[PDB]
PDB file of all heavy atoms in Angstrom:
ATOM      1  N   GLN A  68     -24.904   5.061  -1.972  1.00  2.00           N
ATOM      2  CA  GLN A  68     -26.075   4.917  -1.190  1.00  2.00           C
ATOM      3  C   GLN A  68     -25.889   5.320   0.242  1.00  2.00           C
ATOM      4  O   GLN A  68     -26.742   6.063   0.818  1.00  2.00           O
ATOM      5  CB  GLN A  68     -26.556   3.523  -1.316  1.00  2.00           C
ATOM      6  CG  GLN A  68     -27.038   3.123  -2.749  1.00  2.00           C
ATOM      7  CD  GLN A  68     -25.970   3.067  -3.753  1.00  2.00           C
ATOM      8  OE1 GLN A  68     -24.888   2.467  -3.529  1.00  2.00           O
ATOM      9  NE2 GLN A  68     -26.197   3.674  -4.907  1.00  2.00           N
ATOM     10  N   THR A 404     -21.059  -2.431  -7.493  1.00 24.06           N
ATOM     11  CA  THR A 404     -21.321  -1.280  -6.626  1.00 24.06           C
ATOM     12  C   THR A 404     -22.371  -1.697  -5.645  1.00 24.06           C
ATOM     13  O   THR A 404     -23.098  -0.852  -5.035  1.00 24.06           O
ATOM     14  CB  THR A 404     -21.812  -0.089  -7.496  1.00 24.06           C
ATOM     15  OG1 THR A 404     -23.081  -0.569  -8.018  1.00 24.06           O
ATOM     16  CG2 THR A 404     -20.906   0.267  -8.579  1.00 24.06           C
ATOM     17  N   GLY A 405     -22.464  -2.977  -5.295  1.00 27.49           N
ATOM     18  CA  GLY A 405     -23.533  -3.426  -4.368  1.00 27.49           C
ATOM     19  C   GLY A 405     -24.951  -3.106  -4.835  1.00 27.49           C
ATOM     20  O   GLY A 405     -25.093  -2.886  -6.090  1.00 27.49           O
ATOM     21  N   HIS A 406     -25.823  -3.081  -3.984  1.00 25.12           N
ATOM     22  CA  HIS A 406     -27.268  -2.900  -4.314  1.00 25.12           C
ATOM     23  C   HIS A 406     -27.485  -1.469  -4.907  1.00 25.12           C
ATOM     24  O   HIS A 406     -26.748  -0.597  -4.609  1.00 25.12           O
ATOM     25  CB  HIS A 406     -28.097  -3.045  -3.098  1.00 25.12           C
ATOM     26  CG  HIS A 406     -28.084  -4.393  -2.453  1.00 25.12           C
ATOM     27  ND1 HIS A 406     -27.459  -5.506  -3.001  1.00 25.12           N
ATOM     28  CD2 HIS A 406     -28.631  -4.774  -1.292  1.00 25.12           C
ATOM     29  CE1 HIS A 406     -27.711  -6.556  -2.112  1.00 25.12           C
ATOM     30  NE2 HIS A 406     -28.371  -6.057  -1.106  1.00 25.12           N
ATOM     31  N   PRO A 407     -28.604  -1.332  -5.564  1.00 29.34           N
ATOM     32  CA  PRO A 407     -28.914  -0.044  -6.125  1.00 29.34           C
ATOM     33  C   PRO A 407     -29.642   0.797  -5.111  1.00 29.34           C
ATOM     34  O   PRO A 407     -30.074   0.370  -4.051  1.00 29.34           O
ATOM     35  CB  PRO A 407     -29.883  -0.380  -7.238  1.00 29.34           C
ATOM     36  CG  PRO A 407     -30.515  -1.656  -6.840  1.00 29.34           C
ATOM     37  CD  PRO A 407     -29.376  -2.417  -6.119  1.00 29.34           C
TER      38      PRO A 407
ATOM     39  N   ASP D 259     -26.255   2.453 -12.425  1.00 58.57           N
ATOM     40  CA  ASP D 259     -26.485   1.719 -11.190  1.00 58.57           C
ATOM     41  C   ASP D 259     -27.977   1.790 -10.819  1.00 58.57           C
ATOM     42  O   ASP D 259     -28.269   1.385  -9.677  1.00 58.57           O
ATOM     43  CB  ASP D 259     -25.556   2.210 -10.143  1.00 58.57           C
ATOM     44  CG  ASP D 259     -24.158   1.811 -10.411  1.00 58.57           C
ATOM     45  OD1 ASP D 259     -23.903   0.566 -10.370  1.00 58.57           O
ATOM     46  OD2 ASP D 259     -23.262   2.646 -10.500  1.00 58.57           O
TER      47      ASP D 259
HETATM   48 NA1  LIG E 503     -24.952  -0.127  -6.327  1.00 78.92          NA
END
Side-chain angles (χ1 to χ4, degrees):
Chain A
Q68 295 66 50
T404 67
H406 295 353
Chain D
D259 290 297

